[PDB]
Every structure is written in structure tokens, then in C-alpha cells.
Amino acid sequence: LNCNNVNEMKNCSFNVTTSIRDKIKKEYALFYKLDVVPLTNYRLINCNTSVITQACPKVSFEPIPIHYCAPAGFAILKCNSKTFNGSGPCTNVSTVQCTHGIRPVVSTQLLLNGSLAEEEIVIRSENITDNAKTIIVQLNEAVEINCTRPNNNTRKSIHIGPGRAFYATGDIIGNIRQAHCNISKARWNETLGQIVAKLEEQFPKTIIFNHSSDPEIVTHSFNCGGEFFYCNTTPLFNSTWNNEQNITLQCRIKQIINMWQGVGKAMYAPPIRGQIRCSSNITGLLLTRDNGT
Amino acid sequence: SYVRPLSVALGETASISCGRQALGSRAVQWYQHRPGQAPILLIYNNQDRPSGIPERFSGTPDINFGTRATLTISGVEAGDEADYYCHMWDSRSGFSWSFGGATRLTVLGQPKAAPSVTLFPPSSEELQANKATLVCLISDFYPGAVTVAWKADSSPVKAGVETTTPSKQSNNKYAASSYLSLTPMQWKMHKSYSCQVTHEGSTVEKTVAPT
Amino acid sequence: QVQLQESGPGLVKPSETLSLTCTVSGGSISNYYWSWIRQSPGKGLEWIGYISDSESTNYNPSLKSRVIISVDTSKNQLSLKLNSVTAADSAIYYCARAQQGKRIYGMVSFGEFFYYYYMDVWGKGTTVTVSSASTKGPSVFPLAPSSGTAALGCLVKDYFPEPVTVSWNSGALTSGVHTFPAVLQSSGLYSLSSVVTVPSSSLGTQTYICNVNHKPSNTKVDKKVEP
Ligand SMILES: *[C@@H]1O[C@H](CO)[C@@H](O[C@@H]2O[C@H](CO)[C@@H](O[C@@H]3O[C@H](CO[C@H]4O[C@H](CO[C@H]5O[C@H](CO)[C@@H](O)[C@H](O)[C@@H]5O[C@H]5O[C@H](CO)[C@@H](O)[C@H](O)[C@@H]5O)[C@@H](O)[C@H](O[C@H]5O[C@H](CO)[C@@H](O)[C@H](O)[C@@H]5O)[C@@H]4O)[C@@H](O)[C@H](O[C@H]4O[C@H](CO)[C@@H](O)[C@H](O)[C@@H]4O[C@H]4O[C@H](CO)[C@@H](O)[C@H](O)[C@@H]4O[C@H]4O[C@H](CO)[C@@H](O)[C@H](O)[C@@H]4O)[C@@H]3O)[C@H](O)[C@H]2NC(C)=O)[C@H](O)[C@H]1NC(C)=O
Ligand SMILES: *[C@@H]1O[C@H](CO)[C@@H](O[C@@H]2O[C@H](CO)[C@@H](O)[C@H](O)[C@H]2NC(C)=O)[C@H](O)[C@H]1NC(C)=O
Ligand SMILES: *[C@@H]1O[C@H](CO)[C@@H](O[C@@H]2O[C@H](CO)[C@@H](O)[C@H](O)[C@H]2NC(C)=O)[C@H](O)[C@H]1NC(C)=O
Ligand SMILES: *[C@@H]1O[C@H](CO)[C@@H](O)[C@H](O)[C@H]1NC(C)=O
Ligand SMILES: *[C@@H]1O[C@H](CO)[C@@H](O)[C@H](O)[C@H]1NC(C)=O
Ligand SMILES: *[C@@H]1O[C@H](CO)[C@@H](O)[C@H](O)[C@H]1NC(C)=O
Ligand SMILES: *[C@@H]1O[C@H](CO)[C@@H](O)[C@H](O)[C@H]1NC(C)=O
Ligand SMILES: *[C@@H]1O[C@H](CO)[C@@H](O)[C@H](O)[C@H]1NC(C)=O
Ligand SMILES: *[C@@H]1O[C@H](CO)[C@@H](O)[C@H](O)[C@H]1NC(C)=O
Ligand SMILES: *[C@@H]1O[C@H](CO)[C@@H](O)[C@H](O)[C@H]1NC(C)=O
Ligand SMILES: *[C@@H]1O[C@H](CO)[C@@H](O)[C@H](O)[C@H]1NC(C)=O
Ligand SMILES: *[C@@H]1O[C@H](CO)[C@@H](O)[C@H](O)[C@H]1NC(C)=O
Ligand SMILES: *[C@@H]1O[C@H](CO)[C@@H](O)[C@H](O)[C@H]1NC(C)=O
Ligand SMILES: *[C@@H]1O[C@H](CO)[C@@H](O)[C@H](O)[C@H]1NC(C)=O
Ligand SMILES: *[C@@H]1O[C@H](CO)[C@@H](O)[C@H](O)[C@H]1NC(C)=O
């Protein structure tokens, strides 16, 4: 690819075979820097790793309530106890044919559109005294998150084969802006304080929040409108607790989302036309503990 | 820069469209520059104007992207004939050192007046200095386009005469000069000298003799 | 309020520093932006450059390697020094006050704004002519009338370079005054002609004198007018 810049995503061009196998065209399109690597001439990030299949531009990524049922002659057992920590014996048990409405929200660092808790916020872990064990927090009152890609991008259809139509990003109409999110400084402060509360019921000492130790794990990554954001969440967890204002993160965007198994294939999220803006409830959280603090 | 012509009628509403439409959010400036004269800031922010500009100078804002920038001049007058520059500032394009192309406004259908020709003979001093000069003066005509004809007695001259290109005035009419350089003997050997100024379709005559 | 006035040689030779200055009236020199703009015949307006209240330099890249816009805050004076001038540089030079605007379209923190500049008050204009030809003073020859109303004037013959100023009775007589545009004669010198329409009663005798001034020649002359 022969890539330029804009001001970030590149502006590339490339010879590609067409619907006729011996006729060559040179198309242009934009590719986020994460979706390309230098060899200036460029290429796609995966070409030395795995096959990539463009997701059909008609299947949606919408988290839908999935109800898990056990076969006839089996049973699923609930636990209605409004303070039930991870494991142990539950005293308010009930039986159900199917689970409630589950949304397969494939998220990272901040759980989205999940099931809240009743009464107070709970925190779960296996051996909380073992630091190499994740901590799954559950909030009792969602704190609003609002994300958007304000760029008014376009979608160009590129015929590179009989019926094989690749959808690329044409250009940006209007202002070039930044993909980001928003949460309330007040609501995330009192909610961070609630999380600080029960970080003492299993500890003593002082609580410190700090940034994360490919970028999928380092940032709040999720799906908004159909494009995968990667919001640098350092403006979220950088506070030490003894005993208006919108928090906005800097989200990048990716179109090539590899898989998590062991060197196989990848995907290409086709571009979304117009602007994108979604609103979600961050109801969970995945922490990780690592002197005197 | 090159010129872009425009013609509105006196009392109408001009719609001067910018020649370099914006790609992003814009902050467009409008300058009224009369040739050989200080420019006048018409509109700085996309619609904001300075102190001392009539309300009839309206500039379109950029609330919803897509609406191009157009300068609107309602109730055009005579003095509104000038150049207009579109200084475009948008997020995408870089630094706009260059003003607009230009849009010269020419108001049509204005009251046609006739010139006031005034011819002065050669001065006493310069005649003693061995040189002559007839100064055919023209002022307050419209439209500003005249042809000057010099007659030595009854015969035309054409040799040794300069003439100004018509220039505008404060009262929006035009004015131009016309100098005929004679030798001091030619000026005396002739009985009379005339100056024919043919404005529109009428010629005016102002003659002088050496007495 | 604030006004401006330039003052330059009016004529500079090729391959030389076209110096210039501009003093402001009624406003501080170090709390605004100042721009310089020229306009040749046949071309449009051209933005030279501009200096900030921080004394920051930024010139039009067209001629960036030539210009240098200085400023001395002891007075309200700031200069401009073009060099290696050529014939295409003959233009009227203006002195205007620029002001800074911040056009915000997204988030002020990510950098989603741009800075635009607008000139709201302008100087009057200093004509500049570049040519190896030497400077020349004019010569005034009166023009007398010959009787209700009548007209008289002064012929400013063969000068170089533009412009000349012509008052009447040092500035007293200002009604009916009508100075005419010059005439570039083939000899390379301009020619002006002022004229004043005067009541026929004042012919005898309300003294009339035209005050001619040509800056590139350090000349100031007067001349009576009478039949
Ligand atoms: C997620 O979280 C994010 C982070 O928290 C959050 O980010 C925010 O995003 C939004 C949108 O994405 C951003 O909103 C924009 O804000 C811009 C800035 O607006 C501010 O500043 C202007 C100008 O301020 C100067 O001028 C005023 C007077 O005019 C002075 O009083 C000021 O002191 C100041 O002057 C000093 O500073 C200048 C520097 O700029 C110096 O140059 C100067 O010398 C002085 O020193 C103010 O007018 C604004 O006031 C408005 O807001 C207050 C509350 O504070 C309200 O009372 C009221 O509603 C006011 O209107 C504000 O303070 C805006 O420019 C921008 O809106 C313009 O642009 C868009 C597109 O770009 C247009 O569609 C829109 O119509 C606006 O255009 C108008 O204005 C421009 C410029 O003036 C004109 O050129 C244009 O023609 C048009 O004019 C028309 O409308 C005018 C009214 O707007 C009217 O006056 C005209 O007559 C004409 O009709 C947009 O609103 C926001 O900045 C982000 N926040 C941050 C912190 O970055 C995000 O929202 C969250 N949510 C998400 C992402 O979902
Ligand atoms: C991306 O680059 C392409 C070129 O590969 C640009 O397309 C050209 O744009 C110019 C104007 O900027 C036109 O004059 C050309 O005709 C265009 N060429 C083709 C083949 O379309 C495109 O504008 C660039 N877009 C961005 C957002 O940078
Ligand atoms: C969390 O749930 C909300 C509400 O269902 C989702 O917002 C929807 O987003 C889709 C596509 O982005 C739109 O078609 C719907 O209209 C939206 N619903 C509402 C009520 O606005 C949001 O996308 C979900 N978040 C995640 C990460 O899946
Ligand atoms: C496409 O092939 C031609 C062959 O001459 C080459 O010149 C051109 O650079 C190629 N395009 C790209 C984007 O490499
Ligand atoms: C592919 O190339 C990238 C260069 O960006 C490199 O980091 C990666 O290790 C390479 N993978 C393989 C399997 O060669
Ligand atoms: C069991 O839990 C449900 C919901 O959490 C509650 O409504 C009910 O009162 C509880 N019953 C007992 C016996 O704890
Ligand atoms: C987000 O806010 C409240 C729950 O506190 C609710 O009105 C809304 O449905 C929530 N959205 C979800 C759960 O997707
Ligand atoms: C949950 O409570 C039981 C006792 O009711 C306890 O044994 C278990 O360790 C608790 N789980 C955690 C993660 O603390
Ligand atoms: C938890 O981990 C610590 C060491 O990190 C270990 O000593 C302890 O036995 C573990 N407890 C349980 C219940 O696994
Ligand atoms: C986005 O761009 C399209 C042009 O392709 C335009 O029709 C539409 O109004 C724009 N929308 C926004 C919100 O800018
Ligand atoms: C998020 O957006 C929703 C709807 O636009 C709004 O009700 C809520 O207050 C917003 N919250 C934050 C933190 O931006
Ligand atoms: C966060 O981690 C960095 C990396 O070592 C460290 O320098 C910093 O002190 C930490 N911040 C807090 C508040 O613990
Ligand atoms: C996240 O943002 C902080 C500043 O807000 C910056 O220092 C840090 O490098 C960013 N993290 C990444 C992974 O870019
Ligand atoms: C942590 O990051 C946030 C970003 O919103 C910032 O407001 C806060 O000052 C930072 N904490 C520091 C610098 O101690
Ligand atoms: C926070 O974001 C919401 C989302 O639209 C917006 O309405 C509100 O004005 C923002 N508040 C601040 C202080 O930026």
C-alpha cells in the first residue's frame, strides 16, 4: 500500500485485480494506523500472521438477550441472595429452566450493559489473597458511559472479484475529530468510592488506582455502533483513597480484530457510514492487584 | 489574483458566493477593497461584523455543515461597487495566507450624467519656458467611458496627446484628464484649438484661442 | 480609537532593501497583532505577514525568504523590510491591526480548533515604485480663468514618481477642489492637474494659491492664479 496521512488514519492506494482477472485498477482508501504497518510503502497488519475475512456487511454485533436452558430432565439452580459472594453455600436457592436474558457483551476492563446488583455493590474473586487472580466487581447503580466517533466517514465499494465486494473508508466529510467517550466525574467518583468501600472489607491499608500494566488488554475495548473502540482509560483509575465535568478518554479505532486462540484467522469490521455514537451502562469492572500500599 | 465579474441592479440584493468553499468548520472573512484604497473589513466571524457596517451586509453562518458561505448585500447602493474578498479558514485546509479570488460588483442602471469639460490654455510661465500644454479636464460623467478628440483649428491632431483612463470619484461619477503638448510656436501659429469629448452618444466641444 | 499611517521611500532601486514604517495612534503597540498587505496593479490583495503581541514572526511563504517584520515598542512604531526588490513589487503597502480568533469545532483539549485572523482597522496606504530611474521634482504652472461661476487650477507637469498632494490656500479652500488623476507620459514622468470651481465674485480679488507637494523630491511649491 502507498499510504499518505491526513493530519489518525492513513490515505493509501494499491493495485488490485478487478472483476476481470487481467485488468488492474489502483484504488485509494483510509486505514487507521493500527490496521497497517510499515515495510513509505505499507501493508495490512495481519498479512504475515493469518487469513482475514471481512465480516458480512449485514450481520450485526448487537448484544442480544441469550437465554441458556438445560435439557429435559436437567435443572439450572439460581441464587437469589442479594449479597452472595463468588462461591460458598447459598440459602435463597431457586430452580429455573433457563437463565435470564444474557447479553454476550464482549468487553474489556469495564463491563458494559451487564446485570447490576441489589442492595450494595459486591466484589468477587477466588483467592483474593492471591494477586494472580482477577477481581470481578459488580456495581449496584450503573454509571453512564457515552462514546462516539464524530468523524462523518463514507463507504466505498471496491469490486475485486466476481461478487466479492470489499467495503473501504472513502474519506472524511467535514471536521476531522477524535473518537472518545464520556462519564460523569461525580457519578464515577461516588461509584469509585463505593468500590473503595469493599476494597477495605477484604483488605486494610490505602487503595491506589493505576493504569494498566495487542492494545486490546491495555485499554477499555468494546464495540460501539459496529466499530471496535480502544479507549485509553488512564483518566479513569489514577486516584489514591486514604482512610459539569465529563471524564473523557481517548479512543482509537481498529478494523482488523484478530482472534484469540493461537495463530489462525482475523476479521475486518467493514466501515460504518455517517457518525457513530452509543450510550452504555458500565456495571462491572475487572481489577488486578499487584510495600505499604 | 484574477477577477470574477458580477452585475446586480441598484436597490437589489447581491449574492456573492465564495470561490473556495470550506471543507470543515469555517470562519470566513469578507473584505470590501476598493481598487487603490484601504480595504474595509465587512465580516470577520462567519456572520459577525465590525462596528460601523450597515445591517444589510449579512454573512451566512456554519451552524449545519453544508451551507456554503455567501455574502449578501441587500439594497445595493452606488458606492457598493468595489472588490470583495472571501478569506476562508477551515479546520481541514491549512493556513490561508491568500485572500479570496475577487468579485468585482458593478451596479447596473445608474443615473447617467454628462461631463463638465473645462479646457485651460497654456500657462504664461511654461510658454516662456518654451513648451505648451492644453489641459482638457473632464469630470462627473457616467458611465465612465469617454473619447477625447483634439482639433487644431478644423483639423484633428492625434499627435502628441495623452489621456487618462476614466477614474471614479467620491460622488461615484468618473473623471479623466487629457493633455496636448504643443510647441510654443505651433500654439500661436494656429487660430483656435478645440476639445471634443464624446460621452455616450453626445460630443461636447470646448475650444480655446491664443489671445 | 486606533488609526495607522505608513511612511516609506516611495521609490527604491532594484536589488535593495525596501524599508518602511507605520506608527499607530490611540492604541498600544504590544497588545494586538499587526499585519502588512500589498496590492499591485492587475493582482489582488496579498498578505505579507504579521507580528504578534509576543513579537512572533510569521510571513507569507510566497515571499517568506525576503521579508522581516520588526517592531519597536518604544513608540507605537513597527517596520517592514523587504529586500532584493524587483519591478513586480511596485504596490500600495497598507498597515492594519489584526486580531486573533479561535474557531472551536470539537473538543478544545484534543486540539479541535484553528486560529483565524481578521484585520478590522487599516492604514491609509504608502505607494511604492521600484525602478532604476532617478527621482524627479515637478513644476507648477498656474491656470487662470475667464469669468456667475468660473474655474481655475494648477498644472503639475512632469514628475516622478507618484504621488503628489495638492492643497488650496494651505488647506483653507476645500470646497469645489477637484484634483485629477495623473498621466504617465511616454517620457516616464507623471502629470497632474488640480482645479477649483470658484464664485465669479471672488475673482477680484480673493487670493488663491495652490500648495503642491512631492515627497520623493523634498519639494514644496506654491503658485498664485489670476487672469
Ligand atoms: C463529551 O465530553 C467532551 C469533553 O467534556 C465534550 O466536548 C465538547 O464537544 C462539543 C461538541 O463536540 C464542543 O462544543 C463546541 O464548542 C465550541 C466552543 O464554544 C465555546 O466557546 C465559544 C466562543 O468563546 C469565545 O467567544 C465568546 C463569545 O462569542 C466569549 O464570551 C468567550 O469568552 C470566548 O472568547 C474568548 O476566547 C476566544 C477563544 O475561543 C478568544 O479568541 C477571544 O479573544 C476571547 O479571549 C462560546 O460562544 C461558547 O458558549 C456556548 O456555551 C455556553 C456554555 O459555556 C452556553 O451558554 C451557550 O450555549 C454558548 O453558545 C462556548 O463557551 C463552539 O464553537 C461549537 O459551536 C460552534 O461550532 C459548531 C460547529 O463547529 C457550529 O455548528 C455551532 O453552531 C457553533 O458555531 C457558531 O459559532 C461559531 C464560532 O463563534 C461561528 O463561527 C458560527 O457561525 C456559529 O455562529 C452561530 O451561532 C452562534 C452561537 O453558537 C451565534 O453567536 C452566531 O451569531 C451564529 O448564530 C461547539 O458548541 C465543546 O467545546 C467540547 N468541550 C470541550 C471542553 O472541549 C462533549 O460535548 C461530550 N459529549 C459528546 C462528545 O457527546
Ligand atoms: C486520499 O488520496 C486520494 C489520492 O489517492 C485523493 O483523491 C484525489 O483527490 C484530489 C483532490 O484532493 C483529486 O483532485 C483527485 O482527482 C483524487 N484522485 C482520485 C483517484 O480520486 C483523496 O482526495 C484523498 N483523501 C483524503 C481524505 O486524504
Ligand atoms: C448497550 O445497550 C444500548 C441500548 O440497547 C446500546 O445502544 C444501542 O446501540 C445500537 C447500535 O449501536 C442502536 O441500534 C440502538 O438504537 C441503541 N439503543 C439505544 C436505546 O440507544 C449500546 O450499543 C450497548 N452497548 C454495547 C457496548 O453493546
Ligand atoms: C501499479 O503498477 C504500476 C505498473 O507500472 C506501477 O507503476 C504503480 O506504481 C503500481 N501502483 C502502486 C500503488 O504501487
Ligand atoms: C509480523 O510482522 C510484525 C511487524 O510489525 C511483527 O511484529 C510480527 O512478529 C510478525 N509476525 C510473524 C508471525 O512473523
Ligand atoms: C430471596 O431473594 C429474592 C430476590 O433476591 C427476595 O425477593 C426474597 O425475599 C428472598 N427470600 C428469602 C427467603 O431470602
Ligand atoms: C442504563 O440505566 C438504567 C439502569 O440503571 C436503565 O434505565 C437502562 O435500561 C440501562 N441500560 C441498560 C441496562 O442497557
Ligand atoms: C464467600 O463466603 C464464604 C462463606 O459464606 C467464604 O467461605 C468464601 O471465601 C467467600 N468468598 C470470597 C471470595 O471471599
Ligand atoms: C491463596 O494464595 C496464597 C498465596 O498467594 C496461599 O498462601 C494461600 O494458601 C491461598 N489460599 C487459598 C484458599 O487458595
Ligand atoms: C455526512 O456527510 C454526508 C455527505 O456524504 C452528508 O450528506 C451528511 O449530512 C453528513 N452528516 C453529518 C452529521 O455531518
Ligand atoms: C450519557 O448520555 C445520556 C443520553 O444522551 C445522558 O442522559 C447521560 O446524562 C449522559 N451521561 C454522561 C456521563 O455523559
Ligand atoms: C503508577 O505506576 C507507575 C509505574 O511504576 C508509578 O511510577 C506510579 O507511582 C504509580 N502511581 C500510583 C498512584 O501508585
Ligand atoms: C493514556 O493517556 C495518558 C495521558 O492521559 C498517557 O500518558 C498514556 O501514555 C496513554 N496510554 C497509552 C497506552 O497511550
Ligand atoms: C488522573 O487523570 C485525570 C484525567 O481526567 C486527571 O483529571 C487527574 O488530574 C489525574 N490525576 C493526577 C494527575 O494525579
Ligand atoms: C457531558 O456530556 C454530555 C453529553 O451530551 C453533554 O450534554 C454535557 O454538556 C457534557 N458536560 C460537560 C461539562 O462537558
Numbering used by the authors:
A (entry chain G): 129 to 135, 153 to 184, 189 to 309, 312 to 321, 321A, 322 to 354, 357 to 365, 368 to 397, ...
B (entry chain L): 6 to 67, 67A, 67B, 67C, 68 to 95, 95A, 95B, 95C, ...
C (entry chain H): 1 to 82, 82A, 82B, 82C, 83 to 100, 100A, 100B, 100C, ...
Paper text:
Viral entry is mediated by the HIV-1 envelope (Env) glycoprotein trimer, a type 1 fusion machine comprised of three gp120 subunits and three noncovalently linked gp41 subunits, which binds to cell-surface receptors and fuses viral and host cell membranes. Entry inhibitors targeting the gp120 subunit have been developed, with a promising small-molecule lead, fostemsavir, the prodrug version of BMS-626529 (temsavir) currently in phase III clinical trials. We engineer crystallization chaperones to identify a crystal lattice suitable for determining high-resolution structures of inhibitors, spanning a range of >6000-fold neutralization potency, in complex with envelope trimers of clade A and B HIV-1 strains. We report here the engineering of a protein crystal composed of a highly glycosylated trimer and two crystallization chaperones, which were adapted antibody fragments.
